[PDB]
């Protein structure tokens, strides 16, 4: 508890509750004035207070009776997928079926009517070939009472029984109708006149033949056709539509789609039933992909006798595959075929007739159309990388290739105006076969160049995936194990495949060595016997919350995202995996904040003790207005187009129903870990289940291992936001509040730390002019030149003293904040605010880790990242693990992939990944440099220090002249220069200036002051800055540096008079240390608020 206040927190009233209540779930102090009462549902009706708590109540019941009904009628326990429709049922909610391969859907929608027919409500099941009508109609028939009104129908029905359902149909009270796809496609009006509280589908995509199905699905819901019309037009129109909220439809269910959902009509489901028709997208994988070194037929019979039976082979084409179909016959495998017999050759390897079956790439990767039967195929062998071929010669080579060639050349820039005869003609005039080939080798960074054929050999990872996924399917509860192997010798090509496999699938192939083999096929085959065994299943669901879509963008680039549930002011998604189903969505920014309006700007004092008050927000969508307290109209612009985040509060509280088990992935910092409780303690009186963890690694494998340190609410953290809302809270309505009775503006003081800033740039102009002194540019024959004080006349240089050394030069530690600010808003001309925003992106995408830390650290990981680069780029041998660091807070920012900046230009432009622009690019690029810097050989060099006299003066200039050896330097580079004899040295020409001995300010000399002072935090580096723009205190000039406008001196000028104690440096730094102790729990939390506070009212005086 953090003794603070939500405004609309209350799972009763839903309003004002606490911070110490509404954790422990009970209502406010108002609905139920008794500390720990024995029950909440018994004392609130002996209050007669008793309000919304009554639907949680009765939602527990009616679940928990049809929980007890599923295992009274049906075996054990229901599955985490049926518990999940389970709830989504008794709420009344529509919704797909997503599941794997048949994991009892057929099971839990008899389950369903029998239990709504037991209520007295009536349903109807559908289901495609009428062989399936009978069979739901035989087990439903010896299951439930005498009571139930059961009914069939089907094409093949008796000649009396036909019209004894047709009958019945349009008059006797039916409870469950059990009929054919076909019926619902030619009776289609008898069923849209009559009405179900429920409707069960099979087979989706037998339905979706028409159009006059979805209309007719909608209709036997009860849902007249004149809305469906108004609603037919709106997503015609262009967007979307809302039903009418007095309607109260009933309860469709589908299963997951083998095909996409295509159409407009599909539209209708998401907007009147707030559910989407998706199809299952199942990429639940768990596949050991290990390398042979090399195309060795013993070899491959090597392996073939250790799977013995269920292998594929995969071979590039027609020809080399009928070759190891001649072979392996005649050392009497049982082998088979694709490109001959592409049925009866298939069905003899799923009885077990055949042990082997050797493939092509778009022969059998083109049919596989069929079944795929994932129990058989246990290892899938790789004879040659999946790729593609082309030549390159005059012709034959393809139109990207010349393009991206002539587009750096520079001929085809006309508007990329693309020809095929006229391309080649380009390429015999200017360039010879030789000069080709040089070019595109020195283009296409990422892919092979094979100069010998003279062939470009591009890795297939989409196709490679596909087979590979053949032998890991979700079979019954269990995930079965398949294992891969490739036959590729050519290096660039496995670790060209490798790298987008790294990329998209985030699995390592691993070399022969290093995999044993009689290990591997153990757990694939135990796993494959347990799969079959009696599964006492036990997959379940999840929910997840992050507070950015972006970082929910990628979330479902790794998961396998089938459907998309908009429910409400958000879009939640859920997806297939071995754990069972997986909910995740976004808040899309905060949830709370301090009322504006009452107490202290919003603090509230009670029992001694400081208590804040917080309020949803809403971000308006027209003007940009932010604002927490509740109204309708943006009191900037008028619009009714607001954003309330209590409505995404609420409907985080519904879906915290349905789900089991609840996470909260933010970002892992005092921000982050203020909205992480905002939403824990909001869903406590709902789900009792929720814990946090703190992802850095937005991949399968940063998660992982943020589920491997999941945690509870770390107080202190909390505690530390919240002593800093106040702070600038506090103090910056009180300074803005002395300009607004003097410079006459209302919101103009960001607070404290935002202005002693202010303060170091009045004074950079103050003594900027004080040390401009005279300088002179000297320039050398055959050497470099050098600056000294100036006025100087004499033309010549004299060597004085030299001396040479053999030093070794260590790289730079991985960025920090402070360290990819200034030294990328330096090599680019770039601010603060915009470098640190493109960082948000390249974080929340997958791309780099935690860019908001201050920690030096690199784990193992990170140096396992750098030195499997080294190992491709083929310098492995340059490699030294640092680690830089034993305190590590996080860790610094550095790239999760092994890719660097050009081979993920390629990657985009080749169709693979995409959502990145230049200015992204290269601030990755400047980063994977850095770290791979940082995780280099040391560079053994050679420096001499020359003691020249040049008129009268003594100077001392250190230089390095020679490299020794390489190391680090490969990417950040190091500069050389030339070497200095004991002579007499003249000067050529002379440049006379003045610039100073204190310099001035740029956006990166102030992360950079700013960090040696001790003001401010990572997360606050850039806004800081920016903020200083944004109410006019600062100016940039032609070097883009820092000054102080006519407005920011007036300002600063003004409170170093009158209010000095509260804007100094020296106490500044003294409050974020405090503060930084409040966040480790070392000093107390409402002790700094005291602190605050006391301040605050001798500043109420002046
Ligand atoms: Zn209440
Ligand atoms: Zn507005």
Same mark, same amino acid.
């Given at each position: 508890?953090?003794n603070?206040?939500?405004?609309?927190?209350?799972?009763?009233?839903?309003?004002?509750?606490?911070?110490?209540?509404?954790?422990?779930?009970?209502?406010?102090?108002?609905?139920?004035?008794?500390?720990?009462?024995?029950?909440?549902?018994?004392?609130?009706?002996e209050?007669?207070?008793?309000?919304?708590?009554?639907?949680?109540?009765?939602?527990? %019941?009616?679940?928990?009776?049809?929980?007890?009904?599923?295992?009274?009628?049906f075996?054990?326990?229901?599955?985490?997928?049926?518990?999940?429709?389970?709830?989504?049922i008794?709420?009344?909610?529509?919704?797909?079926?997503?599941?794997?391969?048949?994991?009892?859907?057929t099971?839990?929608?008899?389950?369903?009517?029998?239990?709504?027919?037991?209520?007295?409500?009536?349903?109807a099941?559908?289901?495609?070939?009428?062989?399936?009508?009978?069979?739901?109609?035989?087990?439903?028939?010896?299951?439930?009472?005498?009571?139930?009104?059961?009914?069939?129908?089907?094409?093949?029905?008796?000649?009396?029984?036909?019209?004894?359902?047709?009958?019945?149909?349009?008059?006797?009270?039916?409870?469950?109708?059990?009929?054919?796809?076909? &019926?619902?496609?030619?009776?289609?009006?008898?069923?849209?006149?009559?009405?179900?509280?429920?409707?069960?589908?099979?087979?989706?995509?037998?339905?979706?033949?028409?159009?006059?199905?979805?209309?007719?699905?909608?209709?036997?819901?009860?849902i007249? *056709?004149?809305?469906?019309?108004?609603?037919?037009?709106?997503?015609?129109?262009?967007?979307?539509?809302?039903?009418?909220?007095?309607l109260?439809?009933?309860?469709?269910?589908?299963?997951?789609?083998?095909?996409?959902?295509?159409?407009?009509?599909?539209?209708?489901?998401?907007?009147?039933?707030?559910?989407?028709?998706?199809?299952?997208?199942?990429?639940?994988?768990?596949?050991?992909h290990?390398?042979?070194?090399?195309?060795?037929?013993?070899?491959?019979?090597?392996?073939?006798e250790? &799977?013995?039976?269920?292998?594929?082979?995969?071979?590039?084409?027609?020809?080399?595959?009928?070759?190891?179909?001649?072979?392996?016959?005649?050392?009497?495998?049982?082998?088979?075929?694709?490109?001959?017999?592409?049925?009866? %050759?298939?069905?003899?390897?799923?009885?077990?007739?055949?042990?082997?079956?050797?493939?092509?790439?778009?022969?059998?990767?083109?049919?596989?159309?069929?079944?795929?039967?994932?129990?058989?195929?246990?290892?899938?062998?790789?004879?040659?990388?999946?790729?593609?071929?082309?030549?390159?010669?005059?012709?034959?080579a393809?139109?990207?290739?010349?393009?991206?060639?002539?587009?750096?050349?520079?001929?085809?820039?006309?508007?990329?105006?693309?020809?095929?005869?006229?391309?080649?003609?380009?390429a015999? $005039?200017?360039?010879?076969?030789?000069?080709?080939?040089?070019k595109?080798?020195?283009?296409?960074?990422?892919?092979?160049?094979?100069?010998?054929?003279?062939?470009?050999?591009?890795?297939?990872?989409?196709?490679?995936?596909?087979?590979?996924?053949?032998?890991?399917?979700?079979?019954?509860?269990?995930?079965?194990?398949?294992?891969?192997?490739?036959?590729?010798?050519?290096?660039?090509?496995?670790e060209?495949?490798?790298?987008?496999?790294?990329?998209?699938?985030?699995?390592?192939?691993?070399?022969?060595?290093?995999?044993?083999?009689?290990?591997?096929?153990?757990?694939?085959?135990?796993?494959?016997?347990?799969?079959?065994?009696?599964?006492?299943?036990?997959?379940?669901?999840?929910?997840?919350?992050?507070?950015?879509?972006?970082?929910?963008?990628?979330?479902?680039?790794?998961?396998?995202?089938?459907?998309?549930?908009?429910?409400?002011n958000?879009?939640?998604?859920?997806?297939?995996?071995?754990?069972?189903?997986?909910?995740?969505?976004?808040?899309?920014?905060?949830?709370?904040?301090?009322?504006?309006?009452?107490?202290?700007?919003?603090?509230?004092?009670?029992?001694?003790?400081?208590?804040?008050?917080?309020?949803?927000?809403?971000?308006?969508?027209?003007?940009?207005?932010?604002?927490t307290?509740?109204?309708?109209?943006?009191?900037?612009?008028?619009?009714?187009?607001?954003?309330?985040?209590?409505?995404?509060?609420?409907?985080?509280?519904?879906?915290?129903?349905?789900?089991?088990?609840?996470?909260?992935?933010?970002?892992?910092?005092?921000?982050?870990?203020?909205?992480?409780?905002?939403?824990?303690?909001?869903?406590?009186?709902?789900?009792?289940?929720?814990?946090?963890?703190?992802?850095?690694?937005?991949?399968?494998?940063?998660?992982?291992?943020?589920?491997?340190?999941?945690?509870?609410?770390?107080?202190?953290?909390?505690?530390?936001?919240?002593?800093?809302?106040?702070?600038?809270?506090?103090?910056?309505?009180?300074?803005?509040?002395?300009?607004?009775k003097?410079?006459?503006?209302?919101?103009?003081?960001?607070?404290?730390?935002?202005?002693?800033?202010?303060?170091?740039?009045? $004074?950079?102009?103050?003594?900027?002019?004080?040390?401009?002194?005279?300088?002179?540019?000297?320039?050398?024959? %055959?050497?470099? %030149?050098?600056?000294?004080?100036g006025?100087?006349?004499?033309?010549?240089?004299?060597?004085?003293?030299?001396?040479?050394?053999?030093?070794?030069?260590?790289?730079?530690?991985?960025?920090?904040?402070?360290?990819?600010?200034?030294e990328?808003?330096?090599?680019?001309?770039?601010?603060?605010?915009?470098?640190?925003?493109?960082?948000?992106?390249?974080?929340?995408?997958?791309?780099?880790?935690?860019?908001?830390?201050?920690?030096?650290?690199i784990s193992? $990981?990170?140096?396992?990242?750098?030195?499997?680069?080294?190992?491709?780029?083929?310098?492995?041998?340059?490699?030294?693990?640092?680690?830089?660091?034993?305190?590590?807070?996080?860790?610094?920012?550095?790239?999760?992939?092994?890719?660097?900046?050009? *081979?993920?230009?390629?990657?985009? $432009?080749?169709?693979?990944?995409?959502?990145?622009?230049?200015?992204?690019?290269?601030?990755?690029?400047?980063?994977?440099?850095?770290?791979?810097?940082?995780?280099?050989?040391?560079?053994?060099?050679?420096?001499?220090?020359?003691?020249?006299?040049?008129?009268?003066?003594?100077?001392?200039?250190?230089?390095?002249?020679?490299?020794?050896?390489?190391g680090?330097?490969?990417?950040?580079?190091?500069?050389?220069?030339?070497?200095?004899?004991?002579?007499t040295?003249?000067?050529?020409?002379?440049?006379?200036?003045?610039?100073?001995?204190?310099?001035?300010?740029?956006?990166?000399?102030?992360?950079?002051?700013?960090?040696?002072?001790?003001?401010?935090?990572?997360?606050?580096?850039?806004?800081?800055?920016?903020?200083?723009?944004?109410?006019?205190?600062?100016?940039?000039?032609?070097?883009?540096?820092?000054?102080?406008?006519?407005?920011?001196?007036?300002?600063?000028?003004?409170?170093?008079?009158?209010?000095?104690?509260?804007?100094?440096?020296?106490?500044?730094?003294?409050?974020?240390?405090?503060?930084?102790?409040?966040?480790?729990?070392?000093?107390?939390?409402?002790?700094?608020?005291?602190?605050?506070?006391?301040?605050?009212?001798?500043?109420?005086?002046?």
């Amino acid at each position: 508890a953090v003794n603070s206040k939500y405004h609309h927190s209350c799972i009763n009233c839903g309003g004002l509750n606490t911070d110490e209540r509404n954790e422990r779930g009970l209502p406010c102090e108002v609905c139920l004035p008794e500390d720990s009462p024995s029950d909440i549902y018994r004392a609130l009706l002996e209050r007669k207070t008793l309000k919304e708590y009554r639907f949680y109540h009765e939602f527990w %019941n009616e679940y928990e009776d049809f929980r007890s009904f599923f295992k009274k009628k049906f075996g054990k326990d229901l599955t985490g997928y049926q518990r999940l429709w389970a709830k989504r049922i008794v709420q009344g909610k529509s919704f797909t079926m997503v599941a794997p391969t048949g994991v009892g859907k057929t099971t839990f929608g008899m389950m369903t009517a029998l239990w709504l027919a037991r209520k007295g409500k009536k349903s109807a099941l559908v289901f495609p070939t009428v062989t399936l009508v009978k069979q739901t109609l035989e087990r439903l028939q010896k299951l439930a009472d005498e009571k139930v009104k059961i009914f069939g129908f089907y094409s093949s029905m008796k000649k009396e029984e036909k019209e004894k359902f047709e009958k019945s149909f349009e008059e006797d009270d039916y409870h469950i109708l059990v009929f054919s796809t076909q &019926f619902v496609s030619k009776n289609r009006e008898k069923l849209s006149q009559k009405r179900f509280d429920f409707v069960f589908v099979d087979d989706v995509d037998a339905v979706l033949k028409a159009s006059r199905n979805i209309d007719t699905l909608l209709m036997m819901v009860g849902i007249p *056709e004149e809305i469906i019309r108004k609603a037919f037009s709106t997503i015609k129109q262009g967007k979307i539509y809302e039903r009418p909220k007095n309607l109260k439809p009933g309860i469709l269910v589908v299963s997951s789609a083998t095909a996409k959902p295509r159409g407009i009509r599909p539209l209708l489901f998401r907007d009147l039933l707030n559910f989407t028709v998706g199809r299952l997208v199942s990429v639940a994988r768990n596949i050991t992909h290990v390398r042979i070194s090399s195309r060795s037929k013993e070899k491959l019979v090597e392996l073939l006798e250790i &799977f013995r039976d269920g292998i594929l082979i995969f071979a590039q084409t027609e020809e080399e595959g009928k070759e190891l179909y001649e072979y392996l016959k005649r050392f009497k495998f049982n082998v088979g075929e694709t490109w001959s017999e592409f049925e009866k %050759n298939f069905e003899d390897f799923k009885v077990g007739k055949i042990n082997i079956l050797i493939g092509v790439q778009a022969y059998y990767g083109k049919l596989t159309r069929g079944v795929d039967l994932p129990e058989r195929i246990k290892y899938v062998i790789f004879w040659g990388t999946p790729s593609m071929r082309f030549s390159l010669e005059l012709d034959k080579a393809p139109r990207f290739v010349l393009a991206r060639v002539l587009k750096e050349m520079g001929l085809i820039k006309a508007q990329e105006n693309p020809d095929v005869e006229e391309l080649r003609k380009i390429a015999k $005039e200017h360039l010879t076969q030789k000069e080709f080939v040089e070019k595109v080798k020195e283009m296409f960074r990422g892919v092979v160049v094979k100069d010998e054929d003279l062939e470009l050999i591009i890795p297939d990872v989409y196709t490679y995936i596909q087979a590979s996924g053949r032998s890991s399917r979700i079979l019954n509860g269990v995930l079965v194990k398949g294992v891969s192997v490739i036959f590729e010798e050519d290096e660039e090509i496995f670790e060209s495949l490798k790298t987008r496999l790294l990329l998209i699938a985030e699995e390592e192939i691993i070399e022969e060595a290093e995999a044993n083999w009689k290990e591997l096929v153990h757990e694939v085959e135990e796993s494959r016997r347990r799969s079959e065994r009696e599964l006492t299943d036990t997959s379940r669901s999840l929910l997840i919350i992050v507070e950015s879509p972006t970082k929910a963008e990628t979330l479902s680039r790794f998961l396998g995202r089938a459907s998309s549930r908009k429910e409400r002011n958000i879009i939640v998604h859920e997806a297939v995996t071995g754990e069972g189903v997986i909910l995740f969505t976004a808040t899309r920014g905060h949830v709370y904040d301090l009322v504006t309006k009452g107490g202290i700007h919003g603090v509230e004092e009670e029992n001694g003790k400081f208590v804040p008050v917080y309020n949803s927000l809403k971000r308006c969508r027209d003007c940009g207005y932010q604002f927490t307290e509740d109204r309708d109209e943006c009191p900037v612009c008028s619009s009714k187009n607001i954003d309330d985040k209590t409505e995404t509060l609420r409907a985080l509280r519904e879906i915290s129903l349905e789900a089991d088990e609840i996470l909260v992935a933010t970002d892992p910092d005092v921000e982050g870990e203020k909205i992480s409780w905002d939403v824990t303690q909001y869903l406590l009186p709902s789900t009792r289940s929720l814990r946090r963890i703190e992802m850095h690694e937005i991949t399968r494998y940063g998660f992982k291992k943020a589920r491997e340190s999941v945690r509870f609410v770390d107080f202190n953290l909390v505690k530390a936001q919240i002593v800093r809302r106040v702070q600038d809270r506090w103090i910056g309505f009180e300074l803005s509040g002395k300009l607004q009775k003097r410079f006459g503006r209302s919101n103009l003081s960001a607070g404290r730390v935002q202005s002693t800033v202010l303060g170091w740039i009045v $004074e950079r102009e103050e003594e900027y002019k004080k040390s401009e002194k005279d300088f002179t540019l000297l320039v050398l024959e %055959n050497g470099v %030149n050098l600056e000294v004080e100036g006025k100087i006349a004499d033309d010549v240089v004299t060597v004085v003293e030299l001396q040479e050394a053999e030093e070794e030069k260590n790289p730079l530690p991985p960025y920090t904040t402070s360290s990819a600010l200034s030294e990328i808003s330096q090599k680019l001309r770039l601010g603060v605010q915009e470098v640190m925003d493109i960082l948000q992106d390249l974080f929340e995408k997958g791309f780099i880790t935690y860019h908001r830390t201050d920690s030096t650290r690199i784990s193992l $990981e990170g140096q396992n990242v750098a030195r499997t680069y080294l190992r491709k780029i083929g310098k492995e041998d340059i490699f030294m693990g640092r680690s830089w660091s034993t305190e590590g807070a996080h860790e610094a920012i550095r790239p999760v992939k092994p890719i660097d900046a050009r *081979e993920l230009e390629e990657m985009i $432009e080749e169709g693979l990944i995409a959502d990145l622009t230049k200015k992204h690019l290269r601030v990755y690029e400047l980063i994977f440099n850095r770290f791979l810097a940082s995780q280099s050989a040391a560079v053994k060099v050679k420096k001499q220090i020359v003691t020249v006299d040049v008129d009268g003066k003594r100077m001392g200039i250190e230089q390095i002249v020679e490299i020794l050896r390489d190391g680090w330097n490969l990417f950040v580079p190091l500069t050389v220069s030339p070497r200095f004899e004991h002579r007499t040295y003249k000067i050529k020409e002379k440049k006379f200036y003045k610039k100073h001995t204190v310099p001035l300010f740029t956006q990166a000399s102030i992360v950079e002051e700013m960090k040696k002072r001790g003001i401010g935090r990572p997360s606050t580096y850039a806004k800081i800055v920016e903020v200083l723009f944004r109410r006019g205190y600062v100016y940039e000039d032609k070097y883009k540096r820092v000054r102080p406008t006519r407005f920011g001196v007036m300002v600063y000028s003004y409170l170093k008079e009158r209010y000095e104690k509260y804007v100094t440096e020296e106490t500044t730094r003294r409050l974020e240390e405090i503060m930084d102790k409040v966040e480790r729990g070392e000093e107390d939390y409402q002790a700094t608020l005291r602190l605050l506070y006391e301040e605050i009212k001798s500043l109420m005086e002046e």
